[PDB]
mmCIF file with all atom_site columns, C-alpha atoms in Angstrom:
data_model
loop_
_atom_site.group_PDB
_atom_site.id
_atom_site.type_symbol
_atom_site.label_atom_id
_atom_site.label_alt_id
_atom_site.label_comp_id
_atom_site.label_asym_id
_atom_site.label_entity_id
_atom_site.label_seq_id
_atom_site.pdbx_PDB_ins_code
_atom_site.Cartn_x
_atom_site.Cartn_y
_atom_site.Cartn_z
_atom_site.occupancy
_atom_site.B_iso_or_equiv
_atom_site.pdbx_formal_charge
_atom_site.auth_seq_id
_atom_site.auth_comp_id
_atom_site.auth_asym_id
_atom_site.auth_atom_id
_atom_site.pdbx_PDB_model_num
ATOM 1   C CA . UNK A 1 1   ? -8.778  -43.461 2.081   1.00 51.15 ? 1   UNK A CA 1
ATOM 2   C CA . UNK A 1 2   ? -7.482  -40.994 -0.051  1.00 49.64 ? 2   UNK A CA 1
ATOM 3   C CA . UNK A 1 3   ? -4.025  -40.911 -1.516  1.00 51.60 ? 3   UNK A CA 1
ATOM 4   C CA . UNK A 1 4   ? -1.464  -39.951 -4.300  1.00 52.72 ? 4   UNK A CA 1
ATOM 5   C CA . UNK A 1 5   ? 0.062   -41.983 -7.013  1.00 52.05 ? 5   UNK A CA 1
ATOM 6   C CA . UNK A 1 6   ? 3.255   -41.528 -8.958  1.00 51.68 ? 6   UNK A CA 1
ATOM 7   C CA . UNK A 1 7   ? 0.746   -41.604 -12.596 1.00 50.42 ? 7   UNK A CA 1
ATOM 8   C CA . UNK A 1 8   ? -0.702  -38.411 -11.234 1.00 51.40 ? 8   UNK A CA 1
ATOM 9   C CA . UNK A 1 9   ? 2.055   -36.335 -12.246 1.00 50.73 ? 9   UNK A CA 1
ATOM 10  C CA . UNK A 1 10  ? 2.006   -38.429 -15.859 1.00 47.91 ? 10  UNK A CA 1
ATOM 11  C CA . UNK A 1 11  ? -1.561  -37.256 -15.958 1.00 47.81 ? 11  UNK A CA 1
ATOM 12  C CA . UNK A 1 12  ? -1.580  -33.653 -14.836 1.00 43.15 ? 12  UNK A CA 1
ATOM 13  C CA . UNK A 1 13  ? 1.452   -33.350 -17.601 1.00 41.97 ? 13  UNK A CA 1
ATOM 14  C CA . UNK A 1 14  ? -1.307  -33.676 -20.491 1.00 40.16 ? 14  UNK A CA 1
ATOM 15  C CA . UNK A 1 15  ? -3.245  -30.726 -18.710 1.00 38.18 ? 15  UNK A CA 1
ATOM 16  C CA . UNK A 1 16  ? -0.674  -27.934 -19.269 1.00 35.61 ? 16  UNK A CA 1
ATOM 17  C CA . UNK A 1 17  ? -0.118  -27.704 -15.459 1.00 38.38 ? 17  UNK A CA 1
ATOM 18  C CA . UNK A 1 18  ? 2.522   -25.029 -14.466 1.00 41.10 ? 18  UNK A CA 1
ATOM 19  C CA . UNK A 1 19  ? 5.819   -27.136 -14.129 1.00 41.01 ? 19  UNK A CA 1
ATOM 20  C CA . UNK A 1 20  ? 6.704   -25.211 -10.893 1.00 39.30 ? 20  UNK A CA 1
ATOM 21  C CA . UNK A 1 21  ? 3.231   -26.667 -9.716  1.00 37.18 ? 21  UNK A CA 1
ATOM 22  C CA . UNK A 1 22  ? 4.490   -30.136 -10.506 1.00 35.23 ? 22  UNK A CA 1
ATOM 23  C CA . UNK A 1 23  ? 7.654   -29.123 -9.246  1.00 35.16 ? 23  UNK A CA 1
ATOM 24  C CA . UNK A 1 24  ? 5.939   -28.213 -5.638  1.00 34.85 ? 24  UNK A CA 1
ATOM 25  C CA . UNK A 1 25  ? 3.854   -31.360 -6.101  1.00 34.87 ? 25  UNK A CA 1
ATOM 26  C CA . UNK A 1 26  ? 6.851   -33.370 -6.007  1.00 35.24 ? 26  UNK A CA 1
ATOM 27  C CA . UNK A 1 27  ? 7.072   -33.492 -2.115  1.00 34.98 ? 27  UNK A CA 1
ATOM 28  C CA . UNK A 1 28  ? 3.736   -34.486 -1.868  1.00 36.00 ? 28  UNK A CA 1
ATOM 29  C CA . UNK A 1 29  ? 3.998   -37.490 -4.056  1.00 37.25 ? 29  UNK A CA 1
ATOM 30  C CA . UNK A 1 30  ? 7.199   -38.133 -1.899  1.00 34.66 ? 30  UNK A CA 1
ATOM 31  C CA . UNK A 1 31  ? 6.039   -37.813 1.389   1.00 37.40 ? 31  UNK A CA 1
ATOM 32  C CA . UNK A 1 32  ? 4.440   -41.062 1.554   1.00 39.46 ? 32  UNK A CA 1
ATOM 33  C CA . UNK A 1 33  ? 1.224   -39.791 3.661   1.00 39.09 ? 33  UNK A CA 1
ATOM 34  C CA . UNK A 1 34  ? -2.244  -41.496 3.671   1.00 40.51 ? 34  UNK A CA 1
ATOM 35  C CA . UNK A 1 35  ? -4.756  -38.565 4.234   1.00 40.45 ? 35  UNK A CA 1
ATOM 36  C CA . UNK A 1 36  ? -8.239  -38.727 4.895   1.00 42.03 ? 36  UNK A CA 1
ATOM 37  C CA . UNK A 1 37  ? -10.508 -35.742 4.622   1.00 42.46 ? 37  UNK A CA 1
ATOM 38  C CA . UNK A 1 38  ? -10.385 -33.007 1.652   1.00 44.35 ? 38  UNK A CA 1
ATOM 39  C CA . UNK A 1 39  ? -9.864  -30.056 4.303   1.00 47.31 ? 39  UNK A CA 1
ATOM 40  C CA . UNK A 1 40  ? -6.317  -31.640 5.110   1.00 51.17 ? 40  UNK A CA 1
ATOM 41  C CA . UNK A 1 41  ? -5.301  -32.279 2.039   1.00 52.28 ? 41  UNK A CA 1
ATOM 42  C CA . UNK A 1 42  ? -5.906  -29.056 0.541   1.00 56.35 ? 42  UNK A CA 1
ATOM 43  C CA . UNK A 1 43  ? -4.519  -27.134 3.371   1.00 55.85 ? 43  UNK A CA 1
ATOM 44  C CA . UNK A 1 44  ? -1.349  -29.217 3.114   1.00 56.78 ? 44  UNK A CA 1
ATOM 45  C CA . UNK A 1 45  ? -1.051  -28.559 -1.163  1.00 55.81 ? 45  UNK A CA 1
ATOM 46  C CA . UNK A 1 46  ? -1.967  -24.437 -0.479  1.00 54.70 ? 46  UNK A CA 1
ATOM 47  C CA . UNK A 1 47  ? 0.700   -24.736 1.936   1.00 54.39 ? 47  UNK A CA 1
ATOM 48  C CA . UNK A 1 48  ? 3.439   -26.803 0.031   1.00 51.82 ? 48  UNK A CA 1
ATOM 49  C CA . UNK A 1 49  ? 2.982   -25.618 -3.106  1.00 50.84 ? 49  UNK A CA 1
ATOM 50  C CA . UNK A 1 50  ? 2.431   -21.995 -1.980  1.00 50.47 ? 50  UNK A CA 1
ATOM 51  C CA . UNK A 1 51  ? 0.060   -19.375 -0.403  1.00 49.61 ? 51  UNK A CA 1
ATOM 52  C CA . UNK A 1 52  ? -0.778  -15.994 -1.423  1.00 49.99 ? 52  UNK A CA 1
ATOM 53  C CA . UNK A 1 53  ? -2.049  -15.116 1.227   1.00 47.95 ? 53  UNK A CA 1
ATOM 54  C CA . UNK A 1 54  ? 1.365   -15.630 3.505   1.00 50.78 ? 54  UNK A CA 1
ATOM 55  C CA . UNK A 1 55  ? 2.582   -12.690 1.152   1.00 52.24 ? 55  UNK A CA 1
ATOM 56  C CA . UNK A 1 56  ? -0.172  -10.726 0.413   1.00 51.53 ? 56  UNK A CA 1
ATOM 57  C CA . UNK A 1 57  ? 0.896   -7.661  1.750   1.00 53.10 ? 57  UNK A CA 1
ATOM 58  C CA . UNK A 1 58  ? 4.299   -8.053  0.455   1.00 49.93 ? 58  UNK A CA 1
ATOM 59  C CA . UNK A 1 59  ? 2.762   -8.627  -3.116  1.00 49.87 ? 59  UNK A CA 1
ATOM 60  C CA . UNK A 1 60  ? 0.073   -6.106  -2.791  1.00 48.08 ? 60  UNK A CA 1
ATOM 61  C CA . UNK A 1 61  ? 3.190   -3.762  -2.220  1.00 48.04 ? 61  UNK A CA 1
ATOM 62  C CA . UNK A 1 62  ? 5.256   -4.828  -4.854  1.00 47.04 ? 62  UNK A CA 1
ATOM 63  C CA . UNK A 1 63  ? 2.345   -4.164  -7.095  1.00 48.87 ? 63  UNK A CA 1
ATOM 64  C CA . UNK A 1 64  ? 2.344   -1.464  -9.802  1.00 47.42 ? 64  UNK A CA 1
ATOM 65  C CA . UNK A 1 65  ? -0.339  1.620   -8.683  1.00 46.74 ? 65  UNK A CA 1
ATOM 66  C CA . UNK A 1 66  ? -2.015  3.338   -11.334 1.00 47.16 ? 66  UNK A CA 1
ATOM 67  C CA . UNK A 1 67  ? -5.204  5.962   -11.701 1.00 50.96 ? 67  UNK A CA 1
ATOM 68  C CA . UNK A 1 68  ? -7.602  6.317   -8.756  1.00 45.60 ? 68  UNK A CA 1
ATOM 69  C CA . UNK A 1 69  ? -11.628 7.011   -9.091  1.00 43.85 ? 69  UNK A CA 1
ATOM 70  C CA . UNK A 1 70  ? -14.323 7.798   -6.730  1.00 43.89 ? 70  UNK A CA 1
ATOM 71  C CA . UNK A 1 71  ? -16.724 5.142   -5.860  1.00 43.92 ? 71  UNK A CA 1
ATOM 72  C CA . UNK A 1 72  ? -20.291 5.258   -4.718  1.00 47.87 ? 72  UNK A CA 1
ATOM 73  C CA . UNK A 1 73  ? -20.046 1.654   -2.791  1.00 46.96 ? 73  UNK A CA 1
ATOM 74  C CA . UNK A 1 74  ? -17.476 2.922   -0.591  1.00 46.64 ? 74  UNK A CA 1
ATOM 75  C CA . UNK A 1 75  ? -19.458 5.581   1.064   1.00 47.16 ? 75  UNK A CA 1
ATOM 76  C CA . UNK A 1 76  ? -21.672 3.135   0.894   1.00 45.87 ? 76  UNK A CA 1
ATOM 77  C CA . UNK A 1 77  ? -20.182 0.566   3.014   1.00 47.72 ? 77  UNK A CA 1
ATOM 78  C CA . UNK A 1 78  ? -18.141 2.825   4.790   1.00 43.29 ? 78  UNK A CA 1
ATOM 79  C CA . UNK A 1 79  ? -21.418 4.455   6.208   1.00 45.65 ? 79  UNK A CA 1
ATOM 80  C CA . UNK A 1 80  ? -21.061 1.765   9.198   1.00 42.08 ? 80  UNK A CA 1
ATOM 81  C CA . UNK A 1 81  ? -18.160 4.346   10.991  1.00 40.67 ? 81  UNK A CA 1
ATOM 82  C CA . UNK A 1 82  ? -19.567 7.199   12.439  1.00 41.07 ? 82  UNK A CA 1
ATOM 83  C CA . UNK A 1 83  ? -16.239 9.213   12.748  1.00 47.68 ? 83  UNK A CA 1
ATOM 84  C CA . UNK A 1 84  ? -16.872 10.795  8.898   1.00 46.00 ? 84  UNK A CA 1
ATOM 85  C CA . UNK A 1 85  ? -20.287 12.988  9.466   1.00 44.86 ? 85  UNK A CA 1
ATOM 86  C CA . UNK A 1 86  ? -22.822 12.852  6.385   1.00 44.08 ? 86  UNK A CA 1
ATOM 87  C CA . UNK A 1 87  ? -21.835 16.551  5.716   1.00 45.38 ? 87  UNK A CA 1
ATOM 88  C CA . UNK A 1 88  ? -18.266 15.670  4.978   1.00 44.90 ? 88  UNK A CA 1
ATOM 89  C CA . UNK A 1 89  ? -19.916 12.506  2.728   1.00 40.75 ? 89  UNK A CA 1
ATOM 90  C CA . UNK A 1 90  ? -21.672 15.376  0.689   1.00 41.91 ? 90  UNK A CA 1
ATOM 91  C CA . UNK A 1 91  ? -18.694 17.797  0.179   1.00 41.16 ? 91  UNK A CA 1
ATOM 92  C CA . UNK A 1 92  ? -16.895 14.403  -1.217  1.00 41.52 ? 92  UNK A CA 1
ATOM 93  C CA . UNK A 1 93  ? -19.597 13.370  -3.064  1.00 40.72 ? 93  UNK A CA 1
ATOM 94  C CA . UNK A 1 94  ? -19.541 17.482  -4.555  1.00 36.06 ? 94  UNK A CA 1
ATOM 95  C CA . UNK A 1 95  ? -16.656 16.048  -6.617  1.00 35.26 ? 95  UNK A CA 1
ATOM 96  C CA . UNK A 1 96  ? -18.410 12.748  -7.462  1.00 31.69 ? 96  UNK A CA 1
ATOM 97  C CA . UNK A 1 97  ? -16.803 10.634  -10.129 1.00 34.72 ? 97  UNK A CA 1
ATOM 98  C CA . UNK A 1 98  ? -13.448 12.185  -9.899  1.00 36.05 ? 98  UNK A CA 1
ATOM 99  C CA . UNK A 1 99  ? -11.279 10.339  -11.887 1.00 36.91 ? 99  UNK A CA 1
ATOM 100 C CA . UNK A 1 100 ? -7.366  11.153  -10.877 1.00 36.25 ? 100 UNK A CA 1
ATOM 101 C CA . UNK A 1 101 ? -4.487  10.867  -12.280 1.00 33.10 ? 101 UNK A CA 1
ATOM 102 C CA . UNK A 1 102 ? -2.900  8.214   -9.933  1.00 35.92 ? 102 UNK A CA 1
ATOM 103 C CA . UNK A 1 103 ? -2.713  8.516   -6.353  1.00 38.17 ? 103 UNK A CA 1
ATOM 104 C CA . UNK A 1 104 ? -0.951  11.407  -5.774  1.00 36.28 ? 104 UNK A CA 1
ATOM 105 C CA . UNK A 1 105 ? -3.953  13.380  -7.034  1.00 36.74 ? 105 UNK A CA 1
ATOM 106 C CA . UNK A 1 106 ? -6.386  11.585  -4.965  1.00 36.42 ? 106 UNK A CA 1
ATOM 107 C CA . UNK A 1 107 ? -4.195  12.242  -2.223  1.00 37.54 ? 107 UNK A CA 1
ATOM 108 C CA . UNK A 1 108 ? -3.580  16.166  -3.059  1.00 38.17 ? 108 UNK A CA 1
ATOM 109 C CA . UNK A 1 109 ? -7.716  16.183  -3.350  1.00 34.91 ? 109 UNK A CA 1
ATOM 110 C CA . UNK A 1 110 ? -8.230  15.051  -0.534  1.00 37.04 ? 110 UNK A CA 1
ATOM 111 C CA . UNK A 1 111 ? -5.895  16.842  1.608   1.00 37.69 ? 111 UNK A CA 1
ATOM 112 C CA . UNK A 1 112 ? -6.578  19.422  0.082   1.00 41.47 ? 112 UNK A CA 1
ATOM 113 C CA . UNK A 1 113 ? -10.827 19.613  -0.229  1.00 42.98 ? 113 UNK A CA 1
ATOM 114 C CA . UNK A 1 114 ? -10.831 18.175  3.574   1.00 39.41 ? 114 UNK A CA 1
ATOM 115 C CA . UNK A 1 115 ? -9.833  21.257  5.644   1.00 38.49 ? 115 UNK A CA 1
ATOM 116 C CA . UNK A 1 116 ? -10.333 22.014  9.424   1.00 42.21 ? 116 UNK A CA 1
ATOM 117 C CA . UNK A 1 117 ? -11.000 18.741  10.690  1.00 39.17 ? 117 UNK A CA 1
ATOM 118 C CA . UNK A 1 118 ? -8.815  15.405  11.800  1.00 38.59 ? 118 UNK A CA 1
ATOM 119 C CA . UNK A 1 119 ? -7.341  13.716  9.341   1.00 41.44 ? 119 UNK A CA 1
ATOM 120 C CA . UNK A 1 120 ? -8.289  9.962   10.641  1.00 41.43 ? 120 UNK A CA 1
ATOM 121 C CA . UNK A 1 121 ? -11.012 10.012  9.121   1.00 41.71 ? 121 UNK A CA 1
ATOM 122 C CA . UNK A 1 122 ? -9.366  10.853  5.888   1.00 38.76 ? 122 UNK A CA 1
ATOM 123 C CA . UNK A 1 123 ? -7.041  8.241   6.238   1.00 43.35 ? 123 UNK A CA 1
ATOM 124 C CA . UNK A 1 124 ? -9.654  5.229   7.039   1.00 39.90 ? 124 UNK A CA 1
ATOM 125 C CA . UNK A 1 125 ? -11.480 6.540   3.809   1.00 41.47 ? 125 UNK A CA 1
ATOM 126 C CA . UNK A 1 126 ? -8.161  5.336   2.389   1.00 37.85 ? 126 UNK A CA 1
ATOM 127 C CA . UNK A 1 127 ? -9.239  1.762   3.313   1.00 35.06 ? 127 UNK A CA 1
ATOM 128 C CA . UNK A 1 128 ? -11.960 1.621   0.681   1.00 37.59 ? 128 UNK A CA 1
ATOM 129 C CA . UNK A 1 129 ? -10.735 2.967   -2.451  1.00 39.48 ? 129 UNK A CA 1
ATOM 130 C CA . UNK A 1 130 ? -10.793 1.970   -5.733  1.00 39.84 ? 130 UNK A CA 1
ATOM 131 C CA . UNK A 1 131 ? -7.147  2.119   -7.155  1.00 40.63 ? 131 UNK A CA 1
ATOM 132 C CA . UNK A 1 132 ? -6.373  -0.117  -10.638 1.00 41.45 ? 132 UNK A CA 1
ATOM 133 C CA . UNK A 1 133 ? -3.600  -2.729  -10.362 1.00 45.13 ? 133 UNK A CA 1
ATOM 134 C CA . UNK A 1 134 ? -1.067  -3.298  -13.175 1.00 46.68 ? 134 UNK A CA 1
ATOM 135 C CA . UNK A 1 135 ? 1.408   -6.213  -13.846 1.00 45.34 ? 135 UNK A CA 1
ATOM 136 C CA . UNK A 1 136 ? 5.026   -5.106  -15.014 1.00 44.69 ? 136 UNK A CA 1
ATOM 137 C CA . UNK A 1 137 ? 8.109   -7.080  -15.186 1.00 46.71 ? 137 UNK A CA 1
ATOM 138 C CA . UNK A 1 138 ? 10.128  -5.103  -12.412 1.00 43.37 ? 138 UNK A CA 1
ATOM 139 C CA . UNK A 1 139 ? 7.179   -5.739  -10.034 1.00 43.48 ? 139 UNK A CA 1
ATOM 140 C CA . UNK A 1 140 ? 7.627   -9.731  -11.084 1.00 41.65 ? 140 UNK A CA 1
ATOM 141 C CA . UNK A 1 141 ? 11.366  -8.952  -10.201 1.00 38.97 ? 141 UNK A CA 1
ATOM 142 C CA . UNK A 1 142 ? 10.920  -7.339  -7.187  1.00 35.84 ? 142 UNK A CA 1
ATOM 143 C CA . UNK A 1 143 ? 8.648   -10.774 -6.010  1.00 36.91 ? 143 UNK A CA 1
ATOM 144 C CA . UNK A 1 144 ? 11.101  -12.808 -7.677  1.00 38.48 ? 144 UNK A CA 1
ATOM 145 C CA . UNK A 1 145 ? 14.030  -11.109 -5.748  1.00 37.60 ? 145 UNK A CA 1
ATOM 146 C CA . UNK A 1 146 ? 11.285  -11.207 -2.441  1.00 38.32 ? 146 UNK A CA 1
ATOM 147 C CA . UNK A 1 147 ? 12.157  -14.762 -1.909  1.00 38.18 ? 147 UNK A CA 1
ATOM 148 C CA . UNK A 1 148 ? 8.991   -16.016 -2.885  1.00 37.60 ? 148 UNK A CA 1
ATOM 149 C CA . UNK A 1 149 ? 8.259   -19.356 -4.275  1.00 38.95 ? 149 UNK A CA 1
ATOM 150 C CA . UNK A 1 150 ? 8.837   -19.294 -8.028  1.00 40.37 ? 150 UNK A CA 1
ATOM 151 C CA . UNK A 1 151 ? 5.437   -20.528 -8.544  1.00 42.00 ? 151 UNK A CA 1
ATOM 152 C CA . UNK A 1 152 ? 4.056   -17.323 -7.198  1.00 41.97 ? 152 UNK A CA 1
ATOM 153 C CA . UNK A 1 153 ? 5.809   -15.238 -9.938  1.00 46.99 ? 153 UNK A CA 1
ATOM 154 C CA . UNK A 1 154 ? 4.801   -17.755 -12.515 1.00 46.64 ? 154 UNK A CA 1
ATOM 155 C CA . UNK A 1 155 ? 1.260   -17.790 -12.753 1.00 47.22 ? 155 UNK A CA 1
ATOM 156 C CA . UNK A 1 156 ? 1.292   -14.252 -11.763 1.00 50.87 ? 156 UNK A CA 1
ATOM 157 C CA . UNK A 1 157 ? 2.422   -13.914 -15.058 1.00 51.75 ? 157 UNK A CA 1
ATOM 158 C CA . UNK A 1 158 ? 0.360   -16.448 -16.397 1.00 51.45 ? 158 UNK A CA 1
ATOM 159 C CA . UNK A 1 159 ? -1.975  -13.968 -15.100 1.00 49.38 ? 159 UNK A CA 1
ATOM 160 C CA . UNK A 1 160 ? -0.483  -10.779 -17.197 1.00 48.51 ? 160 UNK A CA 1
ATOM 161 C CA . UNK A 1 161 ? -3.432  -8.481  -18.175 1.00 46.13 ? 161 UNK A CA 1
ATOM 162 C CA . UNK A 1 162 ? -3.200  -5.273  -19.843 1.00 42.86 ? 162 UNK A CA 1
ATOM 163 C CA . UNK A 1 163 ? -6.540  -3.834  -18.868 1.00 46.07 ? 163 UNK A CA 1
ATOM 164 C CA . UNK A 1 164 ? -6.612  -2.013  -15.169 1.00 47.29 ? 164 UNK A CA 1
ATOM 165 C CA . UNK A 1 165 ? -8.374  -3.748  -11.942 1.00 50.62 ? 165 UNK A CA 1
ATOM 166 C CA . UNK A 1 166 ? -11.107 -1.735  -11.166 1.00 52.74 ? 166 UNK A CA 1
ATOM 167 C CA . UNK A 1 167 ? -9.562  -2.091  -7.013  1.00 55.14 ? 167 UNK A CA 1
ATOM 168 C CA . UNK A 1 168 ? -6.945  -4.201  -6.090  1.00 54.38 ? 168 UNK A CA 1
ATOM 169 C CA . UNK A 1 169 ? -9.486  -6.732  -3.976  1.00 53.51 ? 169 UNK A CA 1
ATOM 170 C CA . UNK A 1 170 ? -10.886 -7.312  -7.524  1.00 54.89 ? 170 UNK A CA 1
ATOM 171 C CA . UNK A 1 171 ? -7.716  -8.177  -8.520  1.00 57.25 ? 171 UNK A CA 1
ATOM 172 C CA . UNK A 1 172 ? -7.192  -10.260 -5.534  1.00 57.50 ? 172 UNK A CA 1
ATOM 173 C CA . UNK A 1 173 ? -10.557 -12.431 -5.761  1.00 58.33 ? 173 UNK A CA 1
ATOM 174 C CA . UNK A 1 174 ? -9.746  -12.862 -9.553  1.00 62.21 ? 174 UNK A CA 1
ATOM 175 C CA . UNK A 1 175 ? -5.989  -14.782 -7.912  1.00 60.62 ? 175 UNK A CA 1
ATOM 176 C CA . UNK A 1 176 ? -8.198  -16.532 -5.577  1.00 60.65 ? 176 UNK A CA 1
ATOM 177 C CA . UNK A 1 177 ? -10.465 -18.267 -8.848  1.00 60.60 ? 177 UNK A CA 1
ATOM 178 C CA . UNK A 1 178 ? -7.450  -18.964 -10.335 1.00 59.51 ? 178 UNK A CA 1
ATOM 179 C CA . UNK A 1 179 ? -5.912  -21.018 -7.893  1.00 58.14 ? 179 UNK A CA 1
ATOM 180 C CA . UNK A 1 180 ? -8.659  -22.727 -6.587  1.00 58.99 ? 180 UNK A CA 1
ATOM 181 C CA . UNK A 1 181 ? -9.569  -23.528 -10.146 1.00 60.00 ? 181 UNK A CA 1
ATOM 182 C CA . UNK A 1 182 ? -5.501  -25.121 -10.030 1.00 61.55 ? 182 UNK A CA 1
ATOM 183 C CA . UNK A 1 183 ? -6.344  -26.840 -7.165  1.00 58.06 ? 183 UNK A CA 1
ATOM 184 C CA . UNK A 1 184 ? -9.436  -28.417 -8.056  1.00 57.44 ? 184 UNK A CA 1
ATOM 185 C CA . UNK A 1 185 ? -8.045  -29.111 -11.305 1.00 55.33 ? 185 UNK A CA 1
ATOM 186 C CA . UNK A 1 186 ? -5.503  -30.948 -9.510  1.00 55.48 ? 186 UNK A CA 1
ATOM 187 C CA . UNK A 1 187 ? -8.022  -32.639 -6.878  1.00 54.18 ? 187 UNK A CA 1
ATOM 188 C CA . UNK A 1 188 ? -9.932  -33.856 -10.169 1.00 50.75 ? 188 UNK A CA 1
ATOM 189 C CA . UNK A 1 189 ? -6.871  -36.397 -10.960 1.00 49.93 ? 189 UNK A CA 1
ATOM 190 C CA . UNK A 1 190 ? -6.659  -37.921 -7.218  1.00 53.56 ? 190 UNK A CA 1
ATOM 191 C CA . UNK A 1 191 ? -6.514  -41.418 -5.813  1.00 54.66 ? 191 UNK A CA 1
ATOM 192 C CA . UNK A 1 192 ? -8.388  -43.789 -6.922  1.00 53.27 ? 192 UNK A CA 1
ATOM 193 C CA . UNK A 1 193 ? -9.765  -45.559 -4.126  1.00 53.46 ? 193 UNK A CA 1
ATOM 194 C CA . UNK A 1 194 ? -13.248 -45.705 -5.583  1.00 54.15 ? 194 UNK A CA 1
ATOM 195 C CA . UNK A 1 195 ? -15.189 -45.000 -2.366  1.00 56.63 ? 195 UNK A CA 1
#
């Protein structure tokens, strides 16, 4: 059976933890529960110690937005919907590798380019784009004032980069490594049943 200790916390302190992480990790060594299987307990600590995906959209909002760039792969993969014909695919791809601004320009383009024809299809090829994520302090503010837990806004900037995301879901897996490499970082130092 697996469990949690008191020494844990000792231990994780010589690892350079995040203190709101030990902070969150708190309840847990105070909630006196015996658990058994790994899926349980790491549900539980994602949920006690905080999700990002239970404020994704509010973070992915709060985010800075910078340049925008055309992308081969999502023609690619948006190829699957059948609402954008291949001849408006080749009057897009006419301005291939079109590097803009931010996304005003994108959106000026592509209003703009795009004429006599519905504009759904213009705004599902919004689904897809490439669009570079940057970290500021007023976004960490805006989070910070958001309610969040203050873990969130801590290793977010823990996680301050100066070079732009190539899309924001690259931005997103790289937050998804980094806290499951907290986590099992955390699940190295469990119980120590022995079995």
């Amino acid at each position: 059976t697996i469990e949690l200790t008191d020494e844990s916390l000792e231990k994780l302190k010589a690892e350079k933890i995040l203190q709101s992480v030990l902070d969150a990790l708190r309840p847990l060594t105070k909630k006196k529960e015996k658990y058994k299987n790994t899926e349980t307990f790491v549900f539980d600590l994602k949920k006690f110690i905080g999700k990002i995906d239970d404020n994704q959209q509010m973070i992915s909002e709060a985010l800075e937005r910078g340049k925008v760039r055309l992308t081969g792969n999502s023609l690619k993969q948006i190829s699957k919907t059948k609402k954008i014909p291949r001849q408006i695919l080749n009057q897009l791809k006419g301005l291939k590798d079109n590097t803009y601004e931010n996304r005003e320009q994108f959106i000026s383009v592509l209003k703009t380019t795009v004429r006599g024809i519905n504009d759904e299809q213009i705004s599902l090829i919004l689904d897809n784009i490439d669009e570079d994520v940057r970290l500021t302090d007023l976004s960490l503010t805006k989070i910070r004032k958001a309610k969040v837990p203050q873990t969130l806004v801590d290793m977010l900037a823990d996680l301050k980069k100066d070079e732009p995301y190539k899309n924001e879901k690259e931005f997103l897996s790289e937050f998804k490594k980094k806290m499951g490499e907290i986590i099992g970082l955390i699940l190295k130092h469990a119980a120590k049943t022995g079995g």
